[PDB]
Amino acid sequence: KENFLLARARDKRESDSERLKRTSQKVDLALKQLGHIR
Amino acid sequence: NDRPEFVRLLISHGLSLGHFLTPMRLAQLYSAAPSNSLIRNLLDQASHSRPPDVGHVLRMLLGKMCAPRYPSAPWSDLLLWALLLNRAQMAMYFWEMGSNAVSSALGACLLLRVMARLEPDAEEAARRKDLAFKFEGMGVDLFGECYRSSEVRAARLLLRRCPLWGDATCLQLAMQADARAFFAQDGVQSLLTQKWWGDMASTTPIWALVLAFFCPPLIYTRLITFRGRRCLRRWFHFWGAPVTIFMGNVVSYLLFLLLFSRVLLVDFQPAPPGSLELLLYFWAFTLLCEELRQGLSGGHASLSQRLRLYLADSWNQCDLVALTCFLLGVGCRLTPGLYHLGRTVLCIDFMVFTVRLLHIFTVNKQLGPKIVIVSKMMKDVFFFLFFLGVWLVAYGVATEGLLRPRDSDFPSILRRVFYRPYLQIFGQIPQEDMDVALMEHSNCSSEPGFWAHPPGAQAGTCVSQYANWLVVLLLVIFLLVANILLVNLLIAMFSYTFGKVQGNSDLYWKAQRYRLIREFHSRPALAPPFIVISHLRLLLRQLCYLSKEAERKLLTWESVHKENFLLARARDKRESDSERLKRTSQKVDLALKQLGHIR
Amino acid sequence: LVALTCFLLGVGCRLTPGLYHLGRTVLCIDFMVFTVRLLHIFTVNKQLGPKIVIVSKMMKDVFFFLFFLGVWLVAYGVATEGLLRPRDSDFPSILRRVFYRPYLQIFGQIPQEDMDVALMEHSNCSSEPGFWAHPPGAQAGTCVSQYANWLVVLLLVIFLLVANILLVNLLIA
Amino acid sequence: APWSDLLLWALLLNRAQMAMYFWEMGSNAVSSALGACLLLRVMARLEPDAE
Amino acid sequence: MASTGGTKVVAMGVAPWGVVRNRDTLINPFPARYRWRGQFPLDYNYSAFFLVDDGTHGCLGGENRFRLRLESYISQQKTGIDIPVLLLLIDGDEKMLTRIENATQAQLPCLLVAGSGGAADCLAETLEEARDRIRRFFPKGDLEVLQAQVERIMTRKELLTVYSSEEFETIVLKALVKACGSSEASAYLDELRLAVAWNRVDIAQSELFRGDIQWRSFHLEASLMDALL
Ligand SMILES: [Ca+2]
Numbered sequence A: 001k002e003n004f005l006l007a008r009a010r011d012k013r014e015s016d017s018e019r020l021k022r023t024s025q026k027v028d029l030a031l032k033q034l035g036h037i038r
Numbered sequence B: 001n002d003r004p005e006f007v008r009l010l011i012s013h014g015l016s017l018g019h020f021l022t023p024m025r026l027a028q029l030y031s032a033a034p035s036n037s038l039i040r041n042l043l044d045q046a047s048h049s050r051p052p053d054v055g056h057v058l059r060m061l062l063g064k065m066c067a068p069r070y071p072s073a074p075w076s077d078l079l080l081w082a083l084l085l086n087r088a089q090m091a092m093y094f095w096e097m098g099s100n101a102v103s104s105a106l107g108a109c110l111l112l113r114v115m116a117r118l119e120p121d122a123e124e125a126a127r128r129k130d131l132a133f134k135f136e137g138m139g140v141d142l143f144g145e146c147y148r149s150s151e152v153r154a155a156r157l158l159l160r161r162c163p164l165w166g167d168a169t170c171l172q173l174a175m176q177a178d179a180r181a182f183f184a185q186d187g188v189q190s191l192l193t194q195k196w197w198g199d200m201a202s203t204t205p206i207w208a209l210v211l212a213f214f215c216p217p218l219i220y221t222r223l224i225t226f227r228g229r230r231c232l233r234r235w236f237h238f239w240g241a242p243v244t245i246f247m248g249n250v251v252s253y254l255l256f257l258l259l260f261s262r263v264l265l266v267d268f269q270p271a272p273p274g275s276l277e278l279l280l281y282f283w284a285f286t287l288l289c290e291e292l293r294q295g296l297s298g299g300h301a302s303l304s305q306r307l308r309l310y311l312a313d314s315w316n317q318c319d320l321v322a323l324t325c326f327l328l329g330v331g332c333r334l335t336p337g338l339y340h341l342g343r344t345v346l347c348i349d350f351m352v353f354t355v356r357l358l359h360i361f362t363v364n365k366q367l368g369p370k371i372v373i374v375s376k377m378m379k380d381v382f383f384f385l386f387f388l389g390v391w392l393v394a395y396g397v398a399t400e401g402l403l404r405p406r407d408s409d410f411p412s413i414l415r416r417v418f419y420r421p422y423l424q425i426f427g428q429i430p431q432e433d434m435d436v437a438l439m440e441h442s443n444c445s446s447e448p449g450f451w452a453h454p455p456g457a458q459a460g461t462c463v464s465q466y467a468n469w470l471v472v473l474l475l476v477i478f479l480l481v482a483n484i485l486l487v488n489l490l491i492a493m494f495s496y497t498f499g500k501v502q503g504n505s506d507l508y509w510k511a512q513r514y515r516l517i518r519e520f521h522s523r524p525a526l527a528p529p530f531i532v533i534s535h536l537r538l539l540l541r542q543l544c545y546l547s548k549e550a551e552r553k554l555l556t557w558e559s560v561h562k563e564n565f566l567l568a569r570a571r572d573k574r575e576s577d578s579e580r581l582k583r584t585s586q587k588v589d590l591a592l593k594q595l596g597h598i599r
Numbered sequence C: 001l002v003a004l005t006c007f008l009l010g011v012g013c014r015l016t017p018g019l020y021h022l023g024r025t026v027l028c029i030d031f032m033v034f035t036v037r038l039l040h041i042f043t044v045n046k047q048l049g050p051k052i053v054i055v056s057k058m059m060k061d062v063f064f065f066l067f068f069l070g071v072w073l074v075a076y077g078v079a080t081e082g083l084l085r086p087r088d089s090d091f092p093s094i095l096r097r098v099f100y101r102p103y104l105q106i107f108g109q110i111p112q113e114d115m116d117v118a119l120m121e122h123s124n125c126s127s128e129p130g131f132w133a134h135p136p137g138a139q140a141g142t143c144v145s146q147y148a149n150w151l152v153v154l155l156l157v158i159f160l161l162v163a164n165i166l167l168v169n170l171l172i173a
Numbered sequence D: 001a002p003w004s005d006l007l008l009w010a011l012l013l014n015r016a017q018m019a020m021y022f023w024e025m026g027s028n029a030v031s032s033a034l035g036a037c038l039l040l041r042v043m044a045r046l047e048p049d050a051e
Numbered sequence E: 001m002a003s004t005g006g007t008k009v010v011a012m013g014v015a016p017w018g019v020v021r022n023r024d025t026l027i028n029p030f031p032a033r034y035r036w037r038g039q040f041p042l043d044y045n046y047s048a049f050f051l052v053d054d055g056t057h058g059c060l061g062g063e064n065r066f067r068l069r070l071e072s073y074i075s076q077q078k079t080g081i082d083i084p085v086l087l088l089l090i091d092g093d094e095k096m097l098t099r100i101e102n103a104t105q106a107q108l109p110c111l112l113v114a115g116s117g118g119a120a121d122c123l124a125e126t127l128e129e130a131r132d133r134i135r136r137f138f139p140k141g142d143l144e145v146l147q148a149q150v151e152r153i154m155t156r157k158e159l160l161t162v163y164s165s166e167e168f169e170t171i172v173l174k175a176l177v178k179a180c181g182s183s184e185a186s187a188y189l190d191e192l193r194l195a196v197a198w199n200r201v202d203i204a205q206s207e208l209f210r211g212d213i214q215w216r217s218f219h220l221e222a223s224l225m226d227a228l229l
């Protein structure tokens, strides 16, 4: 059951929606870095 | 210039709409309609019957019952203007800004569906239907949220009269709009079930109800759950419920049909009427009195308005046809020399009365939508009859011309051209009357040529043998064209019609359920012919700041739930993948700006 | 349980004097009950298995269709019986001509000679005023009225369209 | 076994996500899923509201 | 009026005395009757009023010296859960800059409404041409004094947040967490209850449950019961 749930979670993590969400968050981090660098 | 986003933006930034709107600018808005638009034509017609005269157009479209008394609250006027001009986004905005949201959505759906049948351009009507579907869905969702918040307040909101829409209730607006999705909502159906079961618990089993109906002493046991004077209270609680009245009327109507058949088949002699026929007369008289009572109650309003509302119902039309034919048949029967005419009129009247039993089927989820299916299949048959008539004319006239029957007169010619080929579709093929190889050959004619004698009584005494192979070939072609091709064309039409209704059977049945519950919520508790007691009681009865506070509280509750609904929709929209990608692009632009500025 | 109970009832009736025919009929129906039990064997096969479920649900479809069929049969049969006015009228004959005879018309059994007076002989086989005709059928009534027989024929024409096609194909859909 | 009690409570109250979580945290997973399906389908015929 | 349960939100008004219209009836050393339809009148939607008497009859702004201290005392008060206190600045004149400075020296988180102009926008734009900006939002302001005040305010950005219309609960949670500082897990219970009530899963998982804060069972039992119910 744990292997089954891990496989489901890993499949969910690699979906396009989650990739886009993480990309947005990392762009926010990049904006924070750019704000702090000035 | 139809810029909904700027309309939203400018109002949100401090533009006082109450001071802004004036009759001059309100009339100027209607001047922006296209010259060829439907609303322009309607306004011109209203003026031909200068103020905009929008209220006259609303009266013509929606009728006196539901039409707003425009001008109305600037949001209501703006919503009406947007709906008339088919401005979808601005109508949505004006709805979401105003109050009375559920009734306004139902009225908007009604208006859009009314105007959709009045437009010559097909895609414009499709746009109006799409907008009506959107408004109906918004009303359904808002009422669902309100009902999930509070059942009592939702029920109060559903049954209140809205001044903005001619004091009609939400159920009446949905009925006029044919908004079957609104009736199928769980809160509406729960309220309707509670009305249907009256003071009994809606969880009472059907078998328990029937058993208590046929055994009245079982009422006072624990068989029936209710939600000395105490005995009378329970008696009136059981017998006053709409479902019990419906069951009693079903039993009464079955007994009326049994009595009608008994009289027609046994007791209907040329002698003056006996006891059972007089009982049938009295029963029909009480049915007519019940129809009169329903008409006088509209099925304050003017008498003509109530009568038009009564006549708009097709079941009332069937009742009127049945009662008129019964009266005509009885009048003919009581007249010397018209007994047989009265017999035939009453024979057809029995058919009219018996098909009325189909209305009872709408109480059942399985039987309900099948009535609609049958009603549409009747139109399918009507359209099939054109092809059937053309083919019957061609084939019958050709066969009659080839056979040349000597016993020729107009009724016989009609019988052999139309009636005899028609029965061949159902397997009645008289080969011995059309094929001369199966007849005896005799000199039964004076004309030159060879002749044969058909044995049929109505087949003609003598037919021609010339080119009888062509008659047989025509029969062969007929059996293929009519029995298979045309019949299965009709059957394919039937299948398409059946599938269309079977797709949405629950919506149809729940609208029918609303209609049935509304019909039996106001009917007298006594079934005919004992209903004469209730009619006599009614005749004797006739012949001898806080409210606005509660209204404001209810409307505030509704508007708060509308705001929650809109916030949830906006929050769902913000988290879509398209909006995430758009914001990511914008933030990458900001990062590029930062990188450019840092060098 | 139904099959075994009916078998026991039939055997008990058979062994009792004066109940032999009742036992015969009970066992005749019991054989039908026993034979339909063979359908359980079909579930061993992938093709035959689900067809049993399909037939079981089609039986409910038939049950619901019977309401429309009964309403239309009552209307048409009573109208036709009232128009024809058969002189041999009693409850079993009336029931037969109201329900049984129109029902067989759905399956192609159309007795024109018993309903159309143009195919009958015209005789003074009644004491009432008017014109009468003699149908040849044994259970068609000895004497029927000629008045408005075109309406009987029109009712037959409407019946063949409403029942044989529309209602049957509603059930088929 | 608190997980079984929590799963039963979530199933009775139609709390979908919490029932899923309590199932994935507990043991006897196959039989628990079958029993949950049985209970939910039993209670589905007993409710007046269609949705 | 739209609530279906018990009352939970109370509106409290702090106003200066002498500015209250028709205050003559209130002088009775008892249910008073107030003719508000007759200086400004009291708003009838409030459940309690504090009328701070400045002594100067008709003076405006004398109630700040009590209002700020009351806010601070409520911020330092315990139920035994700490009560979070937040300030929301819609707009303001030059005096709201002094109010914000006083509310920042005595730590109180503040929210600045973006796009509403005034002191709110003046403080928001510098957070996320300085003399030009100060003149832009304060045309008549004393540029040097305003610049010094703005720098004194911006020394302590940890107590300032910007709320933009482009939600409220997330910004409130961020502002409350930003000014906490300590790590004994007793100072974060209020934020945890607010996150449970507002369904702020990510805020809780990111800020509140970090290895710095040493939680254990008795801290989380009440929140678990709240989330279950
Ligand atoms: Ca009626």
Ligand SMILES: [Ca+2]
Pocket (backbone or CB within 6 Å): E082, E084, E176, E180, E187, E188, E189, E190, E191
């Ligand atoms: Ca805290």
